[PDB]
């Protein structure tokens, strides 16, 4: 249970080539103005599905 050799630079990058994290999914808010996630209520306008939520 020990690394027998050091891992070289290209091996290190080649392992890390999948560890990049994906973008979220944005959608334009029902209330105008800004960006929001899908299926989340609006953070700024405070609305969802056209309806208003306090």
């Amino acid at each position: 249970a020990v690394p027998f050799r050091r891992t070289s630079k290209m091996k290190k990058r080649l392992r890390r080539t999948h560890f990049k994290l994906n973008v979220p999914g944005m959608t334009e808010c029902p209330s105008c103005g800004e960006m929001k996630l899908s299926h989340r209520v609006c953070k700024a306008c405070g609305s969802y599905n056209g309806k208003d939520i306090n």
């Binding site: 560890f19 990049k20 994290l21 973008v23 979220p24 944005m26 800004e34 960006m35 929001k36 996630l37």
Partner: protein, 109 residues
């Protein structure tokens, strides 16, 4: 052509680079949106200094909010805080608390 830097903000540079690389080369007005809507540790810091970067237009040479894009931007290491976490068998292992420099250079197109 505006530039702002972070200059040793206490955060691991790799954990910075992961959320940092996804805004490379796209329009700022939606880049700020995707970045404050992704939950990461680094997102408020890069949010802050990116808004400072676009904010270098007020008492500055004049550009405008639209037609403006990130040209190039990167994360650079700062000096590391040496810390010694105690460990079993009295071994006294050593840990590194890293700091990072974050660069944003933004130009109009």
């Amino acid at each position: 052509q505006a530039k702002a830097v972070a200059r040793t903000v206490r955060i691991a540079p790799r954990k910075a680079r992961l959320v940092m690389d996804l805004i490379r080369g796209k329009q700022v007005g939606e880049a700020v949106s995707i970045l404050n809507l992704t939950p990461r540790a680094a997102s408020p810091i890069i949010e802050k200094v990116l808004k400072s970067a676009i904010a270098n237009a007020e008492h500055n040479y004049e550009m405008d909010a639209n037609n403006l894009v990130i040209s190039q931007a990167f994360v650079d290491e700062g000096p590391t805080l040496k810390r010694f976490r105690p460990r079993a068998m009295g071994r006294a292992s050593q840990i590194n608390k890293r700091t990072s420099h974050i660069t944003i250079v933004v130009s109009e197109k």
